[PDB]
Amino acid sequence: APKTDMDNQIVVSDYAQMDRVLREERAYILNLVKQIKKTGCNVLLIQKSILRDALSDLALHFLNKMKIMVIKDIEREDIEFICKTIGTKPVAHIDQFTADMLGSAELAEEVNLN
Amino acid sequence: VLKKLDEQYQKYKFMELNLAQKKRRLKGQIPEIKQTLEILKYMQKKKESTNSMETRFLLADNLYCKASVPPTDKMCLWLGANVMLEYDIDEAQALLEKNLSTATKNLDSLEEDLDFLRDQFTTTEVNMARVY
Amino acid sequence: NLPQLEMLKNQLDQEVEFLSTSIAQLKVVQTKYVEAKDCLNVLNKSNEGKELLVPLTSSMYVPGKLHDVEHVLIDVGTGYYVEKTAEDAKDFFKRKIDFLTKQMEKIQPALQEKHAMKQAVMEMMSQ
Amino acid sequence: VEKYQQLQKDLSKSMSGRQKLEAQLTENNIVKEELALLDGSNVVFKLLGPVLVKQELGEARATVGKRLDYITAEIKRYESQLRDLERQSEQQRETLAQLQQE
Amino acid sequence: DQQKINKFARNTSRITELKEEIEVKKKQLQNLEDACDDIMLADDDCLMIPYQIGDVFISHSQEETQEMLEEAKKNLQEEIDALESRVESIQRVLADLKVQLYAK
Amino acid sequence: AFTELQAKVIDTQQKVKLADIQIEQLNRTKKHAHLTDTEIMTLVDETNMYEGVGRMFILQSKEAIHSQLLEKQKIAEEKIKELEQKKSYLERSVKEAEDNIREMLMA
Amino acid sequence: SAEQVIAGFNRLRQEQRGLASKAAELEMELNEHSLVIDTLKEVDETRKCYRMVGGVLVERTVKEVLPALENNKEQIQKIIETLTQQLQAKGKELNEFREKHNI
């Protein structure tokens, strides 16, 4: 969830408010993560935690565990070559995040080999 | 005469204090018994054994202990009033579904009568402080 | 002279009972760390595979056979849950039995000055 | 005028809401020792909100640290709510009670 | 005396009587889903996520816990907009009693 | 003087009445312990008899109850002695210290 | 002198406070028993019946629990009115012994 002083949207200055803060901070970690597999994804291109504000691992772990292929912190110029050459269309946003603007990789593999 | 109002004053004092208790007793009971329906229904696998799932024993106020729930197929239900009965899978559902309807109905009539009751109490309460 | 020492005797008798109030409930919660410690014995001692009744919720109990006597709770956090060894819990129960017992003997001496000062207020009045 | 007492209420009301969670403040450090008094011998969970949630010992003191963040701050709230609400009460004694005499 | 005030005090009492109940409906649904707050961040569905039902639990993935909780939330949110119908109803009849008291 | 009187009388008062609820409960427990065994054994047969010191109630043998009520009624029989003695003797020092309170006050 | 003046109020402030909440405490058990005779007796009783206190649970016959339940509710209905009669008598001498202090 978008950053101010932290990676998540959680900044706790009160518990009476924290119960009240509990309510709406539960989504972003769930939704966009699930939205990845709601549209469905076998892969995920993600720019770097420096290139993108914060990447919740607690969200990305469940996002990984949804058995999408996450490349977290991936370089943009490969993404560029991914976008144009193999046709993974730009998603900068949820308005732009669909199953279609996703490239379809006849195979995608994390390779420790070679 | 002072004799007319104090009869209302003392009786409306006893009944307004009594009915609001059962009005509140019928108040808290409506969600509670219903939640126990659903808790039971979560636990019930109908035409099967209820509560075959995980459990943590409640030993006393400060303590839990992990265990496995599944019993012979019955559910003990807390009545109050120094009485509890055994209840089976449906016999738990039989009493429990039933008390949801009863506790729901008896409030508003007890409330609406209490509404005019304290309308009788406070109205009488005004004239008594006049004389004495 | 007399009424001024009357109402102050009246007020200090609340200080009597308020500390008498703060000690009394403190013994209950003491004993429910006992009662939790108490139930942990009967549980641990009995057996595995025999029926129980532990409260399901209001209006119901949930029965079942006992297993895992050693996995326990010591109430902590906000209601945060922990497991300990069954002997770890008894001590923490007893530790929480040991704690509340001292505030009792902390309250009673402060409960005493509320009597004597009250009586000292009465003493000038009566005498 | 009630502007004494509503404030005296606002005084007296949050006086306890402050001091209420010192118990769960203590309990959040108690579990941390219970997390220390275990090496993982007995798995720790969390109840705030109904369901049971498995928690790593690191996640545990992260949770009870959250649960310490679910406590410490609501204790810190009141001390200012003590003063004005007796004072502005006394200041409403210096206004509304002054409003009465004139 | 007057016959209005004791009836005039009836709607006022049922205002906050009914109005406050939405809070505990929120706070539960608020706190009921804290059970969801805790589960996806730490402890995902690689393990089991039990949904507490009374004294016993139903163990299942990250998902079914956020489901069986949602229905405990879902049933609770319906009475919110069902009660606010009667909550907002009781205040205006009070104002309707505020009209005819000034004459008597 | 009334300065020292309030401390002496309350201390010994809470010493004696301790041993009282200490002794009298043991007898009443024992006396009430006779009831539950007669309550279960009145049934011709029962498949469920639960024992607990709290909101947990576990299935256990009816034979284990009488022996659990054996030493219990034996220990409750043992403790009463000094619990009468700590009541009987410590009853003295509270009233003896409470005597000069009102009578010197009434005078 | 002023001794019973300070005692009488203090006596009647303590016990009437103590007997203030004892009147309706049974009346909720009255409500609880009037509830159970309405809720429990409405469902069938063929079932093994329990008398429960905090510590221990007793196994009982379906018949044997009946003399315990309603006699309590009647024991409830009986002594709620008499203790309340004793409260109003305290309130008179309490106010009697309060005014001498607040004079």
CB contact at 8 A, D68 and D60: no
- What one-letter code names the amino acid at A44? L
- Inspect the interface and report whether the beta carbons of E68 and B115 lie closer than 8 Å: no
Q: How far is A26 from E39, CA to CA, in rounded Å?
A: 10
Q: How far is B4 from B123, CA to CA, in rounded Å?
A: 13
Closest chain A CA to residue D68: A15
Q: Where are the beta strands (DSSP E) in E1-104?
A: 49-53, 56-60
Q: Return the exposure string of G11-37: e unless at least 16 CB atoms fall within 10 Å of the residue's CB, then b.
A: ebbeebeeeeeebbebbbbbbbbbbbb
Q: How far is E25 from E23, CA to CA, in rounded Å?
A: 5
Q: Nearest CB to G59: which of F43, F52, F55?
A: F43
CB contact at 8 A, F54 and C33: no
Q: Return the exposure string of F41-55: e unless at least 16 CB atoms fall within 10 Å of the residue's CB, then b.
A: eeeeeeebbbbbbbb
Q: A110 CA to chain D: closest CA distance, Å?
A: 28
DSSP state of A26: G
Axis crossing angle, helix C2-46 with helix G3-18, rounded to the nearest 10: 30
Other chains touching D, judged by 3 or more CB pairs under 8 Å: A, C, E
CB contact at 8 A, C82 and D31: yes
What is the widest separation between alpha-carbon atoms in chain A? 55
Q: How far is C43 from C38, CA to CA, in rounded Å?
A: 9
- What one-letter code names the amino acid at F73? Q
Of A15, G59, D51, A77, the closest CA to residue F58 belongs to G59
Query: How many of the other CB atoms lie within 10 Å of CB of D38?
Result: 18
Write the Ramachandran bin of C64: left for phi over 0, alpha for psi from -120 to 50, otherwise beta. Answer: left
The structure's method of determination equals cryo-EM
Write the Ramachandran bin of E59: left for phi over 0, alpha for psi from -120 to 50, otherwise beta. Answer: beta
> Cα dihedral angle (A73, A75, A76, A78), rounded to 10 degrees?
-130
Q: How far is G92 from G17, CA to CA, in rounded Å?
A: 14
Q: How far is A51 from A80, CA to CA, in rounded Å?
A: 14
Query: How many of the other CB atoms lie within 10 Å of CB of E97?
Result: 17
Of B75, E30, B82, G81, the closest CA to residue A19 belongs to E30
Axis crossing angle, helix E34-41 with helix E4-32, rounded to the nearest 10: 10
CB contact at 8 A, B22 and B120: no
- Inspect the interface and report whether the beta carbons of B25 and G32 lie closer than 8 Å: yes
Using only C-alpha atoms, chain G has a radius of gyration, in whole angstroms, of 21
CB contact at 8 A, B41 and B35: no
Q: Containing H/E element for F82?
A: helix F62-106
Closest chain F CA to residue G3: F106
CB contact at 8 A, C51 and F59: yes
- What one-letter code names the amino acid at E46? C
Of C16, F104, C25, E68, the closest CA to residue B53 belongs to E68
Tokens at F6, concatenated: 């309030």
- What one-letter code names the amino acid at D32? K
- Which H, E and C letters describe chain B, residue by residue? CCHHHHHHHHHHHHHHHHHHHHHHHHHHHHHHHHHHHHHHHHHCCCCCCCCCCEEEEEEECCEEEEEECCCCCCCEEEEECCEEECCCHHHHHHHHHHHHHHHHHHHHHHHHHHHHHHHHHHHHHHHHHHHC
Q: D40 CA to chain C: closest CA distance, Å?
A: 9
Using only C-alpha atoms, chain A has a radius of gyration, in whole angstroms, of 16
Q: How far is D92 from D99, CA to CA, in rounded Å?
A: 9
Using only C-alpha atoms, chain F has a radius of gyration, in whole angstroms, of 22
Q: Name all contacts of F76-82 with Cβ < 8 Å and 24+ positions apart.
A: F76/F26, F76/F27, F76/F29, F76/F30, F77/F26, F77/F30, F79/F22, F79/F23, F79/F26, F80/F23, F80/F26, F80/F27, F82/F19
- Which H, E and C letters describe chain G, residue by residue? CCHHHHHHHHHHHHHHHHCCCHHHHHHHHHHHHHHHHHHCCCCCCCCCEEEECCCCEEEECCCCCHHHHHHHHHHHHHHHHHHHHHHHHHHHHHHHHHHHHHC
Tokens at F10, concatenated: 């309350």
Of G7, F7, F103, F100, the closest CA to residue C2 belongs to G7
Residues of E in contact with A22 (CB under 8 A): 30-31, 33-34, 37
Tokens at B111, concatenated: 């409330």
Residues of F in contact with C41 (CB under 8 A): 53
Tokens at B72, concatenated: 């012979």
Give the contacts of G9 (CB within 8 A, at least 6 positions apart): C6, C10, G94, G97, G98, G100, G101
Angle at A79 between CA A77 and CA A84, to 5 degrees: 95
- Inspect the interface and report whether the beta carbons of A58 and E42 lie closer than 8 Å: yes
Of E56, C27, F48, the closest CA to residue B64 belongs to E56
Residue from A7, A8, A15 to probe the interface with D (highest D Cβ count within 10 Å) = A15
CB contact at 8 A, D68 and D21: no
- Inspect the interface and report whether the beta carbons of F6 and C127 lie closer than 8 Å: no
Residues paired with E49 in a beta bridge: E60
β-strands A43-45, A69-71 pairing: parallel
Distances (CA, A) of E66 to C65, D52, E33, E52, E77: 29, 12, 8, 12, 16
Give the contacts of D85 (CB within 8 A, at least 6 positions apart): D7, D8, D10, D11
- Inspect the interface and report whether the beta carbons of G43 and B95 lie closer than 8 Å: yes
Q: How far is B120 from B105, CA to CA, in rounded Å?
A: 23
Q: Return the exposure string of G41-58: e unless at least 16 CB atoms fall within 10 Å of the residue's CB, then b.
A: eebebebbbbbbeeebbb
Closest chain C CA to residue F58: C52
Tokens at D75, concatenated: 């204790």
CB contact at 8 A, C77 and C25: no
CB contact at 8 A, D54 and D61: no
Residues of chain C immediately before an interruption (C to N > 2.5 Å)? none
Residues paired with B85 in a beta bridge: B77, G49
Tokens at B91, concatenated: 């016999």
Residue from G56, G61, G64 to probe the interface with F (highest F Cβ count within 10 Å) = G56
Identify the residue whose tokens are 């004597």: C116
Give the three-state DSSP class for D1.
coil
Q: How far is C46 from C23, CA to CA, in rounded Å?
A: 35
Tokens at B1, concatenated: 């005469």
Q: How far is B51 from C62, CA to CA, in rounded Å?
A: 8
Q: Containing H/E element for E62?
A: helix E62-100
Q: G52 CA to chain B: closest CA distance, Å?
A: 6
Phi, psi of D20, rounded to the nearest 5 degrees:
-65, -40
CB contact at 8 A, B23 and B111: yes
Q: F89 CA to chain G: closest CA distance, Å?
A: 29
Identify the residue whose tokens are 């305290």: G90
- Inspect the interface and report whether the beta carbons of E37 and A62 lie closer than 8 Å: no
